[PDB]
């Protein structure tokens, strides 16, 4: 009907999200070098966080740390139309919820990583000038 | 008598854009007019 919000989203924190569920098995995960024991400084209910790329150790900054969804005996899950499992290598920042081997539901967050005009604005437009943070195109079609 | 030169000359190839950058006022108008009109 009209006048009817049909949309709520909060961005503040990326919500990285797997379309299948079961247990989080975490693959080049080790404490202290890739995943930390980051336990909540209010409450402590939290499980082992990944660390940043930079604030981790050098050779766990090499590893690269994965969250891979299996079911709930154990068996990787993998992608549908795909043999890859459900791999997720987690960026930095990336705040981990789930324990080892705890049950998930479908849209998951697996990290928790928050997050002119005038006339010079018509005279930058018709000198074609680059702007500052360009956008990162993909120039050709491809698996990244 | 000669005396020394050598102050930057304003060319063509300052682009629009740095025209309107700048806050300082051209030397003598582009446009084909006085500093009246």
């Known amino acids: ?17 797997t379309e299948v569920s079961g247990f989080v098995r975490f693959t080049d995960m080790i404490d202290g070098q890739t ?12 499980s082992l966080v990944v660390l940043d790329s930079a604030e981790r150790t050098a050779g ?4 690269r740390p994965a969250l891979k969804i299996v079911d709930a005996q154990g068996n990787d899950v993998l992608i549908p139309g795909t043999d890859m499992p459900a791999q997720y290598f987690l960026p930095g920042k990336a705040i981990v919820q789930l324990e080892d081997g705890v049950q ?26 680059r702007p500052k943070e360009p956008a990162i195109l993909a120039e050709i079609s491809g698996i990244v | ?12 190839t300052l682009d629009t ?16 007019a006085s500093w009246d009109t």
């Open chain 1, 1 to 17: 009907a009209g006048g009817e919000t049909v949309a709520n989203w909060d961005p503040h924190t990326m919500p990285v999200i």
């Open chain 2, 17 to 32: 854009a740095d025209a309107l950058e700048q806050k300082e006022m051209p030397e003598e108008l582009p446009l084909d």
């Open chain 1, 60 to 63: 766990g900054k090499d590893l």
């Open chain 1, 104 to 129: 998930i539901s479908s849209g998951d967050t697996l990290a928790r990583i928050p997050q002119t005009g005038g006339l010079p604005r018509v005279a930058d437009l018709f000198e074609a000038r």
């Open chain 1, 35 to 46: 995943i930390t024991r980051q336990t909540d400084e209010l409450t402590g209910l939290s």
């Open chain 2, 1 to 12: 008598e000669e005396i020394d030169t050598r102050e930057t000359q304003d060319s063509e």
